[PDB]
Amino acid sequence: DIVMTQSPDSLAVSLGERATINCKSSQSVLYSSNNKNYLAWYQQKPGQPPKLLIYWASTRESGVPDRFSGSGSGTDFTLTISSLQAEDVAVYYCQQYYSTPLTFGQGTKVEIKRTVAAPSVFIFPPSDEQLKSGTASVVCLLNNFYPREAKVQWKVDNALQSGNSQESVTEQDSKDSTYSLSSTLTLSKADYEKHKVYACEVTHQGLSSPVTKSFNRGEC
Amino acid sequence: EVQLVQSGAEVKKPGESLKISCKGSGYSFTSYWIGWVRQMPGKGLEWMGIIYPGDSDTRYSPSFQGQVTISADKSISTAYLQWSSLKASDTAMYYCARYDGIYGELDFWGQGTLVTVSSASTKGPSVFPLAPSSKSTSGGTAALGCLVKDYFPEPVTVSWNSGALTSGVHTFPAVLQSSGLYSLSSVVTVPSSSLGTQTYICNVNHKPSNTKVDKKVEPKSCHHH
């Protein structure tokens, strides 16, 4: 069995800069007598199948942009994106086909470093419709920010909340290279009706101080 | 062009049998190796096996030998992957692909078949509006959305105004709640002005429960201004 190890696991470079991914095989994949390296590279975008980029280690596949190239030989291989574009955000995999069973690397996530962008923050009270069903979800939206790092704190009647919220984050936008994040506070209708002020406090480096969006229960 | 079209997502109980399919077109089906790759949730790519539809020569990974059957029907240009008895651990995305050979790259790939195996009950979502705030905004930009709560299994699809509204839309990855049910929100930012003039409807589909909901999201009018 041949093990494929990619380095690094994640990398972040600016629009138009050089991105280099490494792949290392546990044994040589160069078939010496025919001089081919039996190695391929794939790009996988979230929700999509992989796409072949390179084969024979350095042959670019038909329809793949000029900026993609592979090189190396034996056990050491590199995929290079010479001028990273916003749409190039994806997981990249190497694959050996020198020996069966065919094996893949664990993938390298490539991300765009862009200028800092503060989140636009929105809070949404539970709907009348949901409240009738007996539950209250309060949603805090952090829209179109960069970098990924963000903290969301729920406060209810000014009291810090813990263990009753869940968050979810989008994949980096293929056009604007930003993230958006939702944080959802879930409580029962009764617990919801036990308090008057609900607040989402957002900490992000694009903001000078934590930004709070709040509402009084019932208000519209 | 070369196209590989896989069968739709499957939801089954453990112990049920399953055959998924992959139809190849735009090339000589009997002239190329065709095979299968597993992708576990959040994980990488595992090679499963290949078959040459010319003569049904079928090769397996040692990991997958005895666990699945790979077959092909050349008369209808279709390759198959089957389990006699499904286990919960078979839950994954499965990709068919055309291969350059036994010792080959994978040059064309199908769209994937999501296979979900669970003894848990299939449940359609409830859909709730996330109405836009009445408070004056900053740059003439309002956010609104739909909360899609309490469904199993994944996925749901969300569209806005039947596909007509695509700009500004973020449909978040689902989160698994402690109830064992998934929940997700889909939001969109729109011009503040449009709230009185433009209707916003989220179209939610949950294929596994054959649930479809169209939820209108409108501003709340609570003041004489």
**Domains of chain B in sequence order:** 1-119 (2.60.40.10), 120-225 (2.60.40.10)
- Strand-by-strand arrangement of the B69-73 sheet: B3-6, B18-25, B78-83, B69-73
Q: How many CB atoms lie within 10 A of CB A209?
A: 6
Tokens of B94: 């499965």
Q: Which residue of B has its CA nearest to A92?
A: B44
CA dist A177 and A56 (Å) reads 32
Instruction: For strands B92-99 and B34-39, give the pairing.
Output: antiparallel
Q: Of A12, A65, A26, whose CA–CA distance to A43 is shortest?
A: A65
Tokens of B199: 């209707």
At B22, which helix (H) or strand (E)? strand B18-25
Q: Collect all residues with Cβ–Cβ distance below 8 Å to B210 and sequence separation of at least 6.
A: B124
Give the three-state DSSP class for B7. Answer: coil
At A181, which helix (H) or strand (E)? strand A179-188
- Strand-by-strand arrangement of the A4-7 sheet: A4-7, A19-25, A76-81, A68-73
CA dist A204 and A176 (Å) reads 18
| Exposure b/e, A40-71, CB count within 10 A at least 16 = b | bbbbbeeeebbbbbbbebbebbeebeebbbbe
Sole residue written with tokens 């079928």: B58
Q: Of A19, A48, A42, whose CA–CA distance to A104 is shortest?
A: A42
Q: Using CA of residue A79, residue A83, residue A87, residue A89, what is the dihedral sign?
A: positive
Q: Strand locations in A45-175, DSSP E?
A: 51-55, 59-60, 68-73, 76-81, 90-96, 103-104, 108-113, 120-124, 135-145, 151-156, 159-160, 165-169
CA dist A128 and A118 (Å) reads 31
Residues A174, A146 contacting (CB under 8 angstroms): no
Q: Do A124 and B104 touch (CB under 8 A)?
A: no
Sole residue written with tokens 């499963």: B48
Residues B164, B203 contacting (CB under 8 angstroms): no
Task: List for chain B the helix, strand, coil content (%; round to 5).
Answer: 10, 50, 45
Sole residue written with tokens 């956010």: B143
- Strand-by-strand arrangement of the A151-156 sheet: A159-160, A151-156, A197-203, A211-216
Q: Per this entry, what is the length of chain A?
A: 220
Residue B72, strand partner residues: B79
Chain B residues with beta carbon closer than 8 angstroms to that of A23: none
Task: Reply yes or no: is the peptide bond before residue A8 cis, omega within 30 of 0.
Answer: yes
End-to-end Cα spacing for chain A: 64
Tokens of A202: 């957002």
Residues B82, B64 contacting (CB under 8 angstroms): no
CA dist A204 and A128 (Å) reads 31
Q: Collect all residues with Cβ–Cβ distance below 8 Å to A13 and sequence separation of at least 6.
A: A19, A84, A110, A112, A113
CA dist B107 and B24 (Å) reads 13
CA dist A112 and B132 (Å) reads 31
Backbone angles phi, psi at A82, to 5 degrees: -75, -25
Chain B residues with beta carbon closer than 8 angstroms to that of A93: 44-45
Tokens of A23: 């792949």
Q: Of B203, B206, B194, whose CA–CA distance to B11 is shortest?
A: B206
Type of residue numbered A92: Y
Instruction: Among 3.40.640.10, 3.40.1160.10, 1.10.260.40, 2.60.40.10, name the CATH number for the domain at A1-113.
Output: 2.60.40.10
Q: CA of B52, closest CA in chain A: separation in Å?
A: 16
Q: Do B102 and A100 touch (CB under 8 A)?
A: yes
- Domain A114-220, what architecture? Sandwich (2.60)
Residues B165, B186 contacting (CB under 8 angstroms): no
Residues A53, A69 contacting (CB under 8 angstroms): no
Q: Of B197, B191, B195, B187, whose CA–CA distance to B139 is shortest?
A: B191
Tokens of A169: 């984050």
Give the three-state DSSP class for A88. Answer: helix
DSSP code for A206 = T
At A187, which helix (H) or strand (E)? strand A179-188
Residues A67, A82 contacting (CB under 8 angstroms): yes
Q: How many CA atoms within 13 Å lie on the side-chain side of B15?
A: 1
Q: Per this entry, what is the length of chain B?
A: 225
CA dist A101 and B45 (Å) reads 13
Instruction: For strands B18-25 and B78-83, give the pairing.
Output: antiparallel
Residues B143, A141 contacting (CB under 8 angstroms): yes
Residues B202, B145 contacting (CB under 8 angstroms): yes
Query: Where do the CATH 2.60.40.10 domains begin and end in chain A?
Result: 1-113, 114-220
Helices (H), chain B: 194-197
CA dist B90 and B83 (Å) reads 9
Backbone angles phi, psi at A190, to 5 degrees: -60, -50
Q: CA of A159, closest CA in chain B: separation in Å?
A: 23
Q: Of A114, A51, A103, whose CA–CA distance to A79 is shortest?
A: A51
CA dist A148 and A116 (Å) reads 10
DSSP string, A2-70: --EEEE-SEEEEETTS-EEEEEEESS--EETTTTEE-EEEEEE-TTS--EEEEETTTEEPTT--TTEEE
Residues A201, A212 contacting (CB under 8 angstroms): yes
CA dist B112 and A48 (Å) reads 8
Query: Is residue A79 left, alpha or beta, with left meaning phi > 0 and alpha meaning psi from -120 to 50?
Result: beta
Chain B residues with beta carbon closer than 8 angstroms to that of A49: 95, 97, 109-112
Tokens of A209: 């101080």
The number of angstroms, rounded, from the C-alpha of B155 to the middle of its chain's C-alpha atoms is: 6
A119 and chain B: CB distance < 8 Å anywhere?
no
Tokens of B55: 């003569």
Instruction: For strands A120-124 and A135-145, give the pairing.
Output: antiparallel
Method: X-ray
CA dist A211 and A202 (Å) reads 5
Residue B6, strand partner residues: B22
Q: Which residue of A has its CA nearest to B127?
A: A130
Q: Do B133 and A122 touch (CB under 8 A)?
A: yes
Q: Which residue of B has its CA nearest to A53?
A: B107
Residues B184, A168 contacting (CB under 8 angstroms): yes
Tokens of B65: 């030998």
Resolution in A: 2.0
CA dist A157 and A193 (Å) reads 12
Triad B209, B215, B219: Cα angle to 5°:
155
Residue A37, strand partner residues: A30
Q: Do B138 and A120 touch (CB under 8 A)?
A: yes
CA dist B19 and B82 (Å) reads 4
Q: Do B47 and A107 touch (CB under 8 A)?
A: no
